Amino acid sequence: AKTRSSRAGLQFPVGRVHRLLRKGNYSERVGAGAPVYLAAVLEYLTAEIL
DNA sequence: CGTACGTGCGTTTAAGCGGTGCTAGAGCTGTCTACGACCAATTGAGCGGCCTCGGCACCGGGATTGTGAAAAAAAAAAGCTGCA
Numbered sequence: 692a693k694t695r696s697s698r699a700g701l702q703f704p705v706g707r708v709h710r711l712l713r714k715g716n717y718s719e720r721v722g723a724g725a726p727v728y729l730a731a732v733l734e735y736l737t738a739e740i741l
Numbered sequence: 742c743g744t745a746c747g748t749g750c751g752t753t754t755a756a757g758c759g760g761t762g763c764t765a766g767a768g769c770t771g772t773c774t775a776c777g778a779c780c781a782a783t784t785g786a787g788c789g790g791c792c793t794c795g796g797c798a799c800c801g802g803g804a805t806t807g808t809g810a811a812a813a814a815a816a817a818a819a820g821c822t823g824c825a
C-alpha cells in the first residue's frame with residue numbers, strides 16, 4: 692500500500708481531503724479526481740505563500 | 742479671477758419598431774456502463790505526549806540618523822551715484 696498523495700506526487704493528504712469533501716455537505720457524490728485536484732491547489736497556494 | 746460647464750438652439754444619425762426568414766444549438770428521451778458508494782479487513786500515516794537546545798526576546802552601549810535653532814554665504818532687491 693502507498694498513499695494517493697504519493698501516486699499524485701503531492702505532500703498534501705489526498706485521502707483526508709476526499710473525506711472532508713464527503714463529510715462537508717458539498718455534494719452527494721465525489722469524483723476520484725476531485726480531491727487530487729484540490730489537494731494540489733491547496734499545496735500550490737501554500738507553497739506560494741511560504 | 743478665469744473658463745469649465747450647463748443651456749438652448751438647429752442638424753444629423755441610428756435606435757427602435759414591426760416584420761420576415763434561417764438554423765445553431767438548447768434541451769429533451771432513451772440505452773448502456775464505467776465509475777463511485779458501500780462494506781469489511783487490514784495496518785500505516787498521523788496524533789498526543791515529552792524532552793532537547795538553538796533561535797529569538799531582551800539588554801546595554803556605542804554608532805548613526807535626523808531635526809531644529811541660530812548663525813554664515815549669497816542672492817537679491819531696493820536706494821544712491823554718476824551717466825552718454
Ligand SMILES: [Ca+2]
Pocket residue numbers: none
Ligand atoms: Ca507533535
